[PDB]
Design a protein around this nucleic acid. Structure first.
Ligand SMILES: [Zn+2]
Ligand SMILES: [Zn+2]
Ligand SMILES: [Zn+2]
Ligand SMILES: [Zn+2]
Ligand SMILES: [Zn+2]
Ligand SMILES: [Zn+2]
Ligand SMILES: [Zn+2]
Lengths: 187, 529, 72, 588, 201, 186
RNA sequence: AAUGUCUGACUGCUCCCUAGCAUGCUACUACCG
RNA sequence: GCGGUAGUAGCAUGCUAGGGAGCAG
């Protein structure tokens, strides 16, 4: 703040002050000079500070509106992300079997917990120990949920492949033990 | 969801060797002593999450005695008529820490700040209006806690999606904040224990009984064994404050949403979705308050069973038979409410069984001779009630009892009470368990809390918590506090030393000397500000 | 004294875990088992034998060159 | 806060105008500031007059008036000169040593590293100044050749959001943490810096984010000169203390040796007879054979193999795959593809295969450093840092191609100047020698031995009658960054039409675009001399397009001519290398 | 909502909402757009309106930037400056905004009505961005013109090929042409369904 | 705040005011030395204030950068600080079994599993060369972890079962140096 | 070549640091009545 | 000689906001 009209008036007031006080003349001179200094600092009491308030309010409004622009930008971004996720998830389900089991529903409104129980293709079985492996995932195929499942890969905790041979009664205490059995719907 | 189940593990804590060396140098941790190390950072191995989610098998279908329930619900409601609730617009909610997790699937794209910052007030009010007419099931995620404890079971907390909290807030916040700002009530949530708060709370609960004894109990597996009916009852009692804002169908749909979101919804433990059978999910929008409601319910039910299961002819006072007789009336013979009976019975309870309730953690100051005769409830009634209405067996090794009414509570909110003469009168004070404070001092989460130089502030907080030990008649106990003070002094000295060393400056002014002098601390417990 | 055993067991488990041992599965289960058993023990002797059994793990590997730190 | 990099006496001062900003005791800092162009010292605070605008950065013109720093025209009546009494006003002034020959670092700091004599200077001082010269040479490279950076801001947006603009055509450097610039605001007057500044691009240009050292207001008329910036400080030795052992110290040699490595059992023992060994293995002499026979001779040992490029590490990997069990070998990959048949990244292993930049931090029985030719003192530093083995093996041949010194423009680095292990191979000489060239024909072996092997490379296979040469200059045409000899390529085409069995030959040239235009006309496989190092072919066609010190480089010519298994043709633009080449000449 | 000026391409988030398509104008360009033509409505990412309740004054020239919002001359705060000053409207990028004087053809397209030939003459002989803007504006105007039409109820369906279609009351009927394709609507009572698209002749 | 030219100004003001009050001056002269001394305080308080503000600002900047440097440099070196702390603790414990196995390991004898505790459950050990075999395996007994073990099988590096009496100082070069012993608990 | 990201619930209370604003209190200076 | 307003600094209290931490259910 230096190129200010009130500051130019302040400057010429100080100039007349130093001039007419350097040539010391009368008391009226000093009186008018002090009054002029007062009016000059009255000019530069506001033109020096109120414009700083203008500046601070402009800056806070500008920063706020930048942050608002950021808000709307990240808004559009998360919108795009959500919709692409929805589309890619959908493009994995539309087997006509689903359409079929929905048609055979008298109103179109079916429960959810049975959709993967009928129309899903892959199975994942988690078995705690050997004895449970005996009762349920035996041979290269087994029957669950009224369908046949052909076993296709087995892994352990570290997820390291385990052929069906190693699941011996006696080899058992040599692997991690929640074993993950992946299967496929036979047909 | 994805092709391989994830196995989550829990790491062990971190050791602060400097403090341990200090404490053994000053003669602590002696063999056979009382104070010791009992609180550690227990580690868990692979299938920890699922082995703790499996604890829901203690939740079984439970059918409630409908008539006595329909009466106790009225009395419980009467315990709750000093507050005010109702819907509020989006531009009046108060969210502290907008920087927490936003549940599953939202946590893939930022914290709650994003969604609370990308939806104008119109969208939020529209979402509310929508759930007032529809149902939105949600997914809940299960997270493993990592904090000090004294029992080596894992602990989990449920993280509810943003769609649930963003609306439950607008539905309940007015009543919640109105509860958290009332003094002298029965529910004591929001009442600070500093600056004499403990004394006022104890005096209020004491409150004019005749032959006072104390008593406190404990629910085993509280959050996993609560049956659905009492949870629904609690939600209804909370929503009772909505007679004008909402219309009737709106209230039912809000009930349905809250049920389908926090009572029996899918849970994303591990990496797969399971089905939660029942019981609360400790992390929703209104846990502590609903637990308080359920607590008061069980207390009232026990009093009712006590009074009804006693022989009439053995009753001396005519007014008490009148009470028991007409209570059987209003329970089974009648069909609809009778306000005056409820009123005078509630007043009777307020005279013979005063209570202090924080969430599932109670203290009771009750007549003793009435209890002996069988006109209020003693521990045995609580045991029977929990058995047939909660499906758990409350062992009597966890239910304390007190006779002299001058040594407080035995224990409430895991604090003990001591009656100390301060200034010129005799006030109550709370003091923790010393092994807890020492454990907190020695074992820290991250390795930057293991360099006392940077973090003196937490030692200040710990000392503020440890102060009231100084008034204990024992002797190791006061030495705890004094050890903390001398530690703070040592830290400040070595810090100035280091600073002068690496650069050569000395600080100009500190005003830290008030931290190792024991009036700054005692200010907290005596009464002003 | 017993507190010293509990404390060094905490530090040892921390070192093991930061040496990536939790990648393997059954081994980490055993280490966690021994650590949680030591933290709850009451008498010093059996705690010491669990301590040696658990230190054997760190010794069985060649990630930490003890011949360096054993210089006093 | 540190130790005087010359004196180890503890210093709190850093040399401002100096590129690395090192620690110099009051006496050493004094010596540098009076003996060089460095007049700026950096301590807790930068040394400058703090009067408004007084940009007095001369260390000799500052005086401690009051609590702030002052010039002469600013010092209040209470002060004194810092730069006085042979030392500077710096902490630990009494415990100052003052190096005797500061001229060493005084020359290492004020040079350009484009002259070979500066490399001699680096090679010919103590190990501390050796690693110092290493850091400063990598710093000179990055500040010159490796990427750049000045940008002038367009306008301010927020506290950390700013519009920028580089100078149209000026190198626009990437925006990373290892890229900071000196922020200059010039009032008119007042060429004052506002600190050091890294930048990063956000989700919209050009309002980017910046992290600033100082917390000053960034004006719109500012600009950020690229600084002498980004390296990694070196604190690791180079050639460990050589300790010859009279016994195979710490190795258990096998009870049964194979014939393939029977040619080197005394060699492996002599490796065991010393702290570290250096062997000279010419191309196609069985360097990988020796390398795997090292471990096959001591079966109960933990060995780690390393080399510069991924290609040589992978070559040792396949050689091991043939001779070393897969379960005990391990390929280490950085976060480009390479070997993976071995278990990828396994530190607790008997055989570790990792490049010099991707070494882990552990111990071993032996670290066999392959490709010593491309090795520099930084590489030795890092291999001694990341690995602590009781024995080291520096396999290779300094007469082969080195690591390129791109910032070097004038001069030729003698193989003695590629490193210091190669220096010892040109002084004390290689401890051993692979004296059986099982790749090149008798002509090519006698050629490379009379050239850069001193007649000492023996010809396994005999005169193949297919190593040819042609003295043809051609017309040397230059495109942007190569040289293309179309008439040379023309006589090569005439050879192909005359020798259709030589259509399988590998076109070789000292450049890339000559290779490219040859392929565009010949169609043959055209590779460069450096890329062919580590590759051997049946028939070769080498067309020395130019006669520059690059094309006529005896290391380059040596390795390029050794690329042949059966025969080779050489269209020679130079006559010296033509006559030194003992091949079957041809008519144009 | 930050972009390049449609005339000088300096970054900007200024638009004059009274223009139908709302293009990105620089500070100088937006000032020239608002002082000369009838677009007395300017908006950045936030609207420029007297945020006082009850005061719905529209033009920016009579607005004053207050504490946090922009207020009229009346409900102005004492400490406030206007939004039209020195030929730049208060928005982002005040100092790097360059502008120019090509506001002539800009006002010509932003004030035209496309009912005459000369408008299309100028729209074909203007600058590239101006040409795309003119195309956009005339497409929006013809879309609004076609939507200014209305309905057409069926009197009798003679066949799939012959139709007895009467058009809206007091409405200029659309001529028998191929371009105007008609979508059909049949309400159950309750749920008007789109019965397809149909062409006439 | 002494090192100020404003300090000299204010001090001259105080001295002149003292002269005015001590010389018995008139009424208006002390007003000149009160209005000027009070404008002098209104400037001196102000400059001392701003300078102490800038000082404390620099000071808190210093403490902040110090905190940062400390934290980061410690986070850098946990992987070694933990090891040295662990081993000083182990040495301070001072038990027989711990020290036994630590010394065996610093020589070269390391187990190949977890040292069991029951009398069953095998235990395997690596022996580097035969001297430690002299200091340890004496006959059919085996002393490890200060407990007694029965040798049940030996083998050298090339998986060759090696008879007990087969080993001796003379025949020592007739075996792969890293022998392996499989013992049980007493 | 990238860069970048990794599980942390709902409440209540308390201490510490910083910022802002107003208000409130006191002093210094200025103008006018 | 008083009042008033305006300024500036100092000081306090309170409220909001931002950050770091502790305990409790
Ligand atoms: Zn409502
Ligand atoms: Zn020195
Ligand atoms: Zn220098
Ligand atoms: Zn100066
Ligand atoms: Zn317009
Ligand atoms: Zn423009
Ligand atoms: Zn208005």
């Amino acid at each position: 703040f230096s190129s200010l009209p009130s500051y130019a008036a302040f400057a010429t007031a100080q100039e007349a002050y130093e001039q007419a006080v350097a040539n010391g003349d009368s008391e009226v001179v000093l009186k008018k000079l002090k009054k002029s200094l007062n009016v000059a600092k009255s000019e530069f009491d506001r033109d020096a500070a109120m414009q700083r308030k203008l500046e601070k309010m402009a800056d806070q409004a500008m920063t706020q509106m930048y942050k608002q622009a950021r808000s709307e930008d990240k808004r559009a971004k998360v919108t795009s992300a959500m919709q692409t996720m929805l589309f890619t998830m959908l493009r994995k389900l539309d087997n006509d079997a689903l359409n079929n089991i929905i048609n055979n529903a008298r109103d179109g409104c079916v429960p959810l917990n049975i959709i993967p129980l009928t129309t899903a293709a892959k199975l994942m079985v988690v078995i705690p120990d050997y004895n449970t492996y005996k009762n349920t995932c035996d041979g290269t195929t087994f029957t669950y949920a009224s369908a046949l499942w052909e076993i296709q890969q087995v892994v352990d905790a570290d997820s390291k492949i385990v052929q069906l041979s190693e699941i011996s009664m006696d080899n058992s205490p040599n692997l991690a033990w929640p074993l993950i059995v992946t299967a496929l719907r036979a047909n | 969801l994805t092709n391989n189940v994830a196995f989550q593990t829990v790491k062990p804590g971190n050791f602060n060797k400097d403090f341990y060396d200090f404490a053994v140098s000053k003669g602590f941790f002696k063999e056979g002593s009382s104070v010791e190390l009992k609180h550690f950072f227990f580690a868990q191995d692979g299938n920890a999450a699922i082995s703790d989610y499996d604890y829901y098998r203690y939740n079984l279908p439970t059918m409630c005695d409908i008539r006595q329930l329909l009466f106790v619900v009225e009395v419980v409601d009467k315990y709750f008529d000093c507050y005010d609730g109702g819907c509020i617009n989006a531009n009046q909610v108060i969210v502290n820490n907008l920087d927490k997790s936003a549940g599953f699937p939202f946590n893939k794209w930022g914290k709650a700040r994003l969604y609370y910052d990308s939806m104008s007030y119109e969208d939020q009010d529209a979402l509310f209006a929508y759930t007032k007419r529809n149902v939105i099931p949600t997914i809940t995620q299960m997270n493993l806690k990592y904090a000090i404890s004294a029992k080596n079971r894992a602990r989990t907390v449920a993280g509810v999606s943003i769609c649930s909290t963003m609306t439950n807030r607008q539905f309940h916040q007015k009543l919640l904040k109105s509860i958290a700002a009332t003094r002298g009530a029965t529910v004591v949530i929001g009442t600070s224990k500093f600056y004499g708060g403990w004394h006022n709370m104890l005096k209020t609960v004491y409150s004019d009984v005749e032959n006072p004894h104390l008593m406190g109990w404990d629910y085993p597996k509280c959050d996993r064994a609560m049956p659905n009916m009492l949870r629904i009852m609690a939600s209804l009692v909370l929503a009772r404050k909505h007679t004008t804002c909402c219309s009737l169908s709106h209230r039912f749909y809000r009930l349905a949403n809250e049920c389908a979101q926090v009572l029996s919804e899918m849970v994303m433990c591990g990496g797969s979705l399971y089905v939660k059978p029942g019981g609360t999910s400790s992390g929703d929008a209104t846990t502590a308050y609903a637990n308080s409601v359920f607590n008061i319910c069980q207390a009232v039910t026990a009093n009712v069973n006590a009074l009804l299961s006693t022989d009439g002819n053995k009753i001396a006072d005519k007014y008490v038979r009148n009470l028991q007789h007409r209570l059987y009336e209003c329970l089974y013979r009648n069909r609809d409410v009778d306000t005056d009976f409820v009123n005078e019975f509630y007043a009777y309870l307020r005279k013979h069984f005063s209570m202090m309730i924080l969430s599932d953690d109670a203290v009771v100051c009750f007549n003793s001779t009435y209890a002996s005769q069988g006109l209020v409830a003693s521990i045995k009634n609580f045991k029977s009630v929990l058995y047939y209405q909660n499906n758990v067996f409350m062992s009597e090794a966890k239910c304390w009892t007190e006779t002299d009414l001058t040594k407080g509570p035995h224990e409430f909110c895991s604090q003990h009470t001591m009656l100390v003469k301060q200034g010129d009168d005799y006030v109550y004070l709370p003091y923790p368990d010393p092994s807890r404070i020492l454990g907190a001092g020695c074992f820290v989460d991250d390795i930057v809390k293991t360099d006392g130089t940077l973090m003196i502030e937490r030692f200040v907080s710990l000392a503020i918590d440890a102060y009231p030990l100084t008034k204990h008649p024992n002797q190791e106990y006061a030495d705890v506090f004094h050890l903390y003070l001398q530690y703070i002094r040592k830290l400040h000295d070595e810090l100035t030393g280091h600073m002068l060393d690496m650069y050569s400056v000395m600080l100009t002014n500190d005003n830290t000397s008030r931290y190792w002098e024991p009036e700054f601390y005692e200010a907290m417990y005596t009464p002003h500000t | 004294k017993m507190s010293d055993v509990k404390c060094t067991s905490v530090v040892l488990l921390s070192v093991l875990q930061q040496l990536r041992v939790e990648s393997s599965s059954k081994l980490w289960a055993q280490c966690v088992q021994l650590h949680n058993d030591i933290l709850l023990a009451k008498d010093t002797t059996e705690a010491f034998e669990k301590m040696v059994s658990l230190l054997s793990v760190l010794l069985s590997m060649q990630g930490a060159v003890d011949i360096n730190k054993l210089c006093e | 806060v540190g130790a005087c990099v010359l004196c180890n006496s503890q210093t709190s001062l850093r040399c401002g105008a100096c590129i690395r900003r090192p620690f110099l005791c009051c006496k050493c800092c004094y010596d540098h500031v009076i003996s060089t162009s460095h007049k700026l010292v950096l301590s807790v605070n930068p040394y400058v007059c703090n009067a408004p605008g007084c940009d007095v950065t001369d260390v000799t013109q500052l005086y401690l008036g009051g609590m702030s720093y002052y010039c002469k025209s600013h010092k209040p009546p209470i002060s004194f000169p810092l730069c006085a009494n042979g030392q500077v006003f710096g902490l630990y002034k009494n415990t100052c040593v003052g190096s005797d020959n500061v001229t060493d670092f005084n020359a290492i700091a004020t040079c350009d590293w484009t002259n070979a004599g500066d490399y001699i200077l680096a090679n010919t001082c103590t190990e501390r100044l050796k690693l110092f010269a290493a850091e400063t040479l990598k710093a000179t490279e990055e500040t010159f050749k490796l990427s750049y950076g000045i940008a002038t801001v367009r306008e301010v947006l927020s506290d950390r959001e700013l519009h920028l603009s580089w100078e149209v055509g000026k190198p626009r450097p990437p925006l990373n943490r290892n890229y900071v610039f000196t922020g200059y605001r010039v009032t008119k007057n007042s060429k004052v810096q506002i600190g050091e500044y890294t930048f990063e691009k956000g989700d919209y240009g050009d309002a980017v984010v910046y992290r600033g050292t100082t917390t000053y207001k960034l004006n719109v008329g500012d600009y950020f000169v690229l600084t002498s910036h980004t390296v990694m400080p070196l604190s690791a030795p180079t050639l460990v203390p050589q300790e010859h052992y009279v016994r195979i110290t710490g190795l258990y040699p096998t009870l049964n040796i194979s014939d393939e490595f029977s040619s080197n059992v005394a060699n492996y023992q002599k490796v065991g007879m010393q702290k570290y060994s250096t062997l000279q293995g010419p191309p196609g002499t069985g360097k990988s054979h020796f390398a795997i026979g090292l471990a096959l001779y001591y079966p109960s040992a933990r060995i780690v193999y390393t080399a510069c490029s991924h290609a040589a590490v992978d070559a040792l990997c396949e050689k091991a795959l043939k001779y070393l069990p897969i379960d005990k070998c391990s390929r280490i990959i950085p976060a480009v593809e390479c070997f993976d048949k071995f278990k990828v990244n396994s530190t607790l292993e008997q055989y570790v295969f990792c490049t010099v930049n991707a070494l882990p931090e552990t111990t071993a029985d032996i670290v066999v450093f392959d490709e010593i030719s491309m090795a520099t003192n930084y590489d030795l530093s890092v291999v001694n840092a990341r690995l602590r083995a009781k024995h080291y093996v520096y396999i290779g041949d300094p007469a082969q191609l080195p690591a390129p010194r791109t910032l070097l423009t004038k001069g030729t680095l003698e193989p003695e100047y590629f490193n210091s292990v190669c220096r010892l191979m040109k002084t004390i000489g290689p401890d051993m020698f692979l004296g059986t060239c099982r790749r090149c024909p008798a002509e090519i072996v006698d050629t490379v031995s009379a050239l850069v092997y001193d007649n000492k490379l023996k010809a396994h296979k005999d005169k193949s009658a297919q190593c040819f040469k042609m003295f043809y200059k051609g017309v040397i045409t230059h495109d942007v960054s190569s040289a293309i000899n179309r008439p040379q390529i023309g006589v090569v085409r005439e050879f192909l039409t005359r020798n259709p069995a030589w259509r399988k030959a590998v076109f070789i040239s000292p450049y890339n675009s000559q290779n490219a235009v040859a392929s565009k006309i010949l169609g043959l496989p055209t590779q460069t001399v450096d890329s062919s190092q580590g590759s051997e072919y049946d028939y070769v066609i080498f067309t020395q397009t130019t006669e520059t010190a690059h094309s006529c480089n005896v290391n380059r010519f040596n390795v390029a001519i050794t690329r042949a298994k059966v025969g080779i043709l050489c269209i020679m633009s130079d006559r010296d290398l033509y006559d030194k080449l003992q091949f079957t000449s041809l008519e144009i | 909502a930050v972009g390049a000026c449609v005339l000088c391409n300096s970054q900007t988030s200024l638009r004059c909402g009274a223009c139908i398509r709302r293009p990105f104008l620089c500070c100088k360009c937006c000032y020239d757009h608002v002082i000369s033509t009838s677009h007395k409505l300017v908006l950045s990412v936030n609207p420029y309106v007297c945020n006082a309740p009850g005061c719905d004054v529209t033009d920016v020239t009579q607005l004053y930037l207050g504490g946090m919002s922009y207020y009229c001359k009346s409900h102005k705060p004492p400490i406030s400056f206007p939004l039209c000053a020195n030929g730049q409207v208060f928005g982002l990028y005040k100092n790097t905004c360059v502008g120019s004087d090509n506001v002539t053809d800009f006002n010509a397209i932003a004030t035209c009505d496309w009912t005459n030939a000369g408008d299309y003459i100028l729209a074909n002989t203007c600058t590239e961005r101006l040409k795309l803007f003119a195309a956009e504006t005339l497409k929006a105007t013809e879309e609004t013109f076609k939507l200014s039409y209305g309905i057409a109820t069926v009197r009798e369906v003679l066949s799939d090929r012959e139709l007895h279609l009467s058009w809206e009351v007091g409405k200029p009927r659309p001529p028998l042409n191929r371009n105007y394709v008609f979508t059909g609507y049949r309400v159950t009572k309750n749920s008007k369904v789109q019965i397809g698209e149909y062409t006439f002749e």
